[PDB]
Design a protein around this nucleic acid. Sequence first.
RNA 1: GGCCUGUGUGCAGGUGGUGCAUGGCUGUCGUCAGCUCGUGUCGUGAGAUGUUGGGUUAAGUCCCGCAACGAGCGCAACCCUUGUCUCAUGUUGCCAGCACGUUAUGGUGGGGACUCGUGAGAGACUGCCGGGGUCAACUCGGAGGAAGGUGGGGAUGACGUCAAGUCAUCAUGCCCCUUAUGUCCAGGGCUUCACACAUGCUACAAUGGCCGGUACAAAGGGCUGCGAUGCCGUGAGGUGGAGCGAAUCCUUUCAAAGCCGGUCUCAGUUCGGAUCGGGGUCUGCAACUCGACCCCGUGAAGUCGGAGUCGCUAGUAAUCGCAGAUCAGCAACGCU
Lengths: 135, 126, 99, 208, 103, 155
Amino acid sequence: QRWLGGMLTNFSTVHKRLQRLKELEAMEQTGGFEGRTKKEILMLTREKNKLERSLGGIRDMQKVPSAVWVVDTNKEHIAVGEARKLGIPVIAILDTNCDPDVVDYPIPGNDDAIRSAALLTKVIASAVAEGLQAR
Amino acid sequence: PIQTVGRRKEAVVRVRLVPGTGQFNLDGRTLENYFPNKVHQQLIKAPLVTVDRVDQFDIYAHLDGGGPSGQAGALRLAIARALILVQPEDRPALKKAGFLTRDPRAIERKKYGLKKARKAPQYSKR
Amino acid sequence: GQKIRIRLKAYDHEAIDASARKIVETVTRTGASVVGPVPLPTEKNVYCVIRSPHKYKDSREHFEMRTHKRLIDILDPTPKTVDALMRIDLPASVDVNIQ
Amino acid sequence: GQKINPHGFRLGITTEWKSRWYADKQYKDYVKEDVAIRKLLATGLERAGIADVEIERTRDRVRVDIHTARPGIVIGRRGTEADRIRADLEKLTGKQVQLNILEVKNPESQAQLVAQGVAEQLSNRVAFRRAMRKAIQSAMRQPNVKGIRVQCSGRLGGAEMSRSEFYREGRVPLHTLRADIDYGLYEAKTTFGRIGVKVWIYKGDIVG
Amino acid sequence: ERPHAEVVVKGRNVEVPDHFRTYVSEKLSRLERFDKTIYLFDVELDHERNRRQRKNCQHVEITARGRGPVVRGEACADSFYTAFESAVQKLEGRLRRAKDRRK
Amino acid sequence: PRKGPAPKRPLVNDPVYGSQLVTQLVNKVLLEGKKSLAERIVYGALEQAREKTGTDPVVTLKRALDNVKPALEVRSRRVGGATYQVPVEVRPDRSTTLALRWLVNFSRQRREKTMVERLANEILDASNGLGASVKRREDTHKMAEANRAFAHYRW
RNA sequence: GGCCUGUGUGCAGGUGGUGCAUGGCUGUCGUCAGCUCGUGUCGUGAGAUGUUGGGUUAAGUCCCGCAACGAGCGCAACCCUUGUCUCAUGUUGCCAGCACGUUAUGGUGGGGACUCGUGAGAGACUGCCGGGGUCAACUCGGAGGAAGGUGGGGAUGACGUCAAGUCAUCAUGCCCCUUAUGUCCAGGGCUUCACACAUGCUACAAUGGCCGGUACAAAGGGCUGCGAUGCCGUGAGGUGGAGCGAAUCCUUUCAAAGCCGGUCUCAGUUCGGAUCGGGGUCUGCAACUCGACCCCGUGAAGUCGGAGUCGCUAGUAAUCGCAGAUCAGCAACGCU
C-alpha cells in the first residue's frame, strides 16, 4: 500500500515497529484475547491490518538496507531523498516526466502501463534470481 | 405459596396475592383508610384495570419504609411481578405499559459548596 | 444447652473473614456447636474537614472510619473447647468480645 | 493544590496501612504514642534512612517492624542502638518492645530512600544533573522499575527564583487504580533555605 | 445620581493623609463627569512592604458597577499619585470603550 | 440543547374524568408540593361548576379553552438599533399551556375570598367570554395585528 | 545516681518582619480537553511538521489520507455507592405456616418462608435484528432487559499560569527583642455604631393562622455518657435511676408537612413577630458589659417589592422536619 516517511533514514524506529509486530503476533499466537476487552481485541485487529498493509519488508531485512530500487518515483520523490541522502546507487524504470539525471543508474520506460511495468518487474526479479543462483 | 417484593425509594413491601376477592389488607386496614388519595388508588389498581381482573385476587401485605407515593409504586410493582408469576402471557402488554420497571429515580447526595444538591449560593460578582 | 456469644470488631473484612474461618475451624475440632458468622451491619463514622489552611472552606474532603462486625454464637461450651478457643493469637486488626 | 498522595488515594484498595490495630477508647493514646515513637526514631537515628515504620498493638504488647537498607550503620552490632531505643520505648511507655528490625532488597526501588539519597547528595555540596539523572538510572536499571518521576523544588544554581523542573522515564499513570505506586517525600536542611523533593515509582499493575 | 457615586476610600495599612482622600474623591468625580450610570466604587490602597522590592511599591484594585457590566481596573506604582492616575486612565479606557459599545 | 432536545413527560389520565389536561391543570396550579391540595381544590371547583350549570364542567372548560387559547403569539428580536417584536405561530401544546398559565395567574388576583371560588368563576367567565384571560389574549392578537409587518422574516 | 534549692553557664522563647527568601498544603482558569518528548526530515535561524485536511465523537475518541514513525502525562475503564438477580445465609433483626401471653405490644417458644442485613458473583457490550454510512468509524429505528447506548451520582484536578493565598496549622533561610516585642496574673474588649455593602431566616396571609383526633421514613450519636418508667411543675425542667459500650436500651414500637373534624372570613386581622417591662428554669467558680430556654404582658416596621440581578433540566427545583460534629453551656437560621 503505502510509503513511510523515513524508513531508510530512521530505520531503527521502524525496527521497533517490527518488534511490536512480533509482540502482537506473539499475543495472537498464545491466544490471549478475552484477557482484555473485546473492543480492544477488535482494535488490535485494526492495528494488525494497518501494520501489515504498511510493513512487510523489515520482517526479513534487519540488515542495514541498501538504497537500490524505487517504487513510484514522481509521486514518492520522498522515497529518493531518503536514499540519495546516503547516496547508494538508485534504480527505477523512469517515471517519464521527471528529473532524469539525479539517479546513478537510470533506465527509461513508462510511468503507468501495467504491462510494461509487470514485464520489467519480472526482468529485475530475473536479475536477482540469477545473481542468487550463481552467488 | 406466593411471596414477592417491590421497592421504590426506601419503600419495601411484601405481597401475598391470594385468589380471593378484591379485598385489600394493609397492616390491618384497607385501601381507603390507608391511602385516602384516589391517585394512589389509581396507581395501585391500574394493573387490575390492565388485565381486567379487579375483584379476582386478594392481597395481604406489610407497610414498610418510604412514604405514601413510594409505598404505592412499590406495591403496584410487586403486584405486577406476582401477576407475571401467576401467568407470563400478560407480560408483553405490561412492559409495554412499564408496570414492571423498578423506578431508578432515587435521591441525590447533598454535596458541598452549596446549600443543597444543586442550588448554589447567590453568586455576586462583588 | 448453654450459650456463649462472641462479637468481633475490626476494620478490614479480609481479616474478620480469615479470623472467623480459623476460629470456626478450632470450634469444629472439638465438635462444639457452631452457629457461624451471622453478619451484623456496619458502622460508618464520618469526619469532614477542610483541605487547606486559612480559607477555602468550599473545598473539602471526607473520610470514613468504618468498623465491620460479626456475631458467632457458640453452643455446647465444653470447657476443654473453651481452653482451646481462649488462647489463639490472631491478626491485630481484630478485637474480640467473649461473653 | 493539584495532586493528592497516591498512597492515600489507593489506601483501602491496592496499597495498605502502616500502623494496624483496633481500638475504641485507647485511640488518642495510641496516636500520641505513635507520633512520639516516630519523632524519637528520627531523633535517635538520622545517618540511615527509615523507609517505613509499621507494627501493631494487642492487649499487652507493642511491636514494631522498621525498614532501612543500612541497618549496619544503625543497630548495635553488640546492641548499643537497639538498647537505647528499647530504653526510649520504656521512657514513653511501651513496656513490651518487640523491636524487630528489617531491611529492603532494592533500595533503589524505594521512593523514600531514593529521595533521601538525592537530598543527601544535595545537602552535601553537590549540583543537580548528575545526582538526579544517576538516581533515575540506578532505579530504571532494575526489573520491576517500570516507571519513575522526580519533582524537585528549590533554589538550584540559579539565584532567587523558586524554580522547579521534573525528570522522568517510563510510565506514571496516577489516575489508574489497578496501578501500584510508591510515593517519596523529603523536607530538610540546606544552606539558602529548604529543598523539597517528591518522587513517584511505578511497579507493574495489580489484578486481584 | 450625582452624589450617588458610592465613594469607598480605604487602605489596609498605609499612612493615609486625608488629602489623598481629596485626591481620590476628585479623581472619581472626574469620571462621574462622563458616566451617568454609576452605583458603586470599591477601591483599595495597598502596600506590599517587602524589602529590596521589584520596582512596584504600592498597588491598587478598583472595581465599579454599571447597569449590568461591571468595570475592573488594576494598577501598580511606587506611590499614590501614579497609582491614582494610572488606574484612572485604565478606567477611562474601559469607560470610553463601554460608552462606545453601549449604543 | 445545542446538541438536541429531549422528550416530554408522559401525562397520566385522570382517575375520575378521562382527560390529561386536568392533571396538567393541577400541575400548573400546584405550589410547594401540595399536589393533593391542588387535586381537592380543582375537584371542588369543577363540581361547583357542575352545580352552577347542571352539566359536566369539562365541556365548558374546553369551551373556555377554545376562547382563550391562541394559535399566534409574539417572539422578539434585537435588530438594527431598535428591537423588533415578531408574530410567530404557536403549536397547540404551548398554546394550551400558556392559556392555562394566563388562566391561573389572572385567577389569583380576584376577590372570591378563596382560590376555589376565584378559579371556578374565572373558568365560567372565560367560557362566557369575559375573563381577563380572554382580555389578555385579545391584547396579544392586537399586538400581532399591529406587527404583521414583520412576517417576511419568517422566524 | 531520681529530684528539685539555687550560681551562672551553654541558653531557652518569640502570634516580631519578609508567603516577593522558601518548602509543603490548597483555591483557581477547568473536570475545559488538551500539553509535550525521542528519532526523523524542512528551514541560515528563531522554529515548523507529527498535533494540519475530510467524517464521527461526552471529548487530540476513532477512521480515510500525506515527511513523519512512534511515544508519555491526559480523557475513557479497573474504585465505592445506588439500580436487578442467584448461592450461602438467622441475632440485637424478619417472623408467613405454627403454638402460647393478650393488653403495650412478635410479647415468648418456634421457620429461614418473604424482607433483611454482609460477603462472593453473573449481568450491558452498539452484544444482537434491521436501515443508513469510504462498509470504515459512527449514527437511525427494534428485541429482550431492571437498566440501552459515556444507566445516574460521587471520588480522581494533564502541563501551567494567576510573584493568587498561607513565615499565625506546622517547618523553615535571613534580620530584630531580650530585662523585654518575651513571660505569670485580675479587669475590660474583639458583641462599640451617625452609616454602606454581601450572604440567609421568618414574614407581608385564606394553597392560610388557631384547636382537637388519627398513620407510615431513613439516618446517624451515647460512659464516669445517654437517660424513660411514676409523679410535681403551665413549661422550660425537676430528685430518681431501670437499661445500655449498645440492629437489644436511650434514642417514643423514631417525626413533621400531610388526612379527617370545628372556628376564624380578606383584615395592618385569631396576619406577623420585632422591640421592651416583669417573673422564673438550667450549665458554669462565674450569665451587667455579653448566653440559651420558658411563662405573662408588650404587639412595631412590613400589604410581594426599581433600575438590574442569582440559581435550577429530574426525584432536580420549591417546601416541612430531623440528625451529627466543634460543644461544659449557647448566638447553630449557620456547616455537613
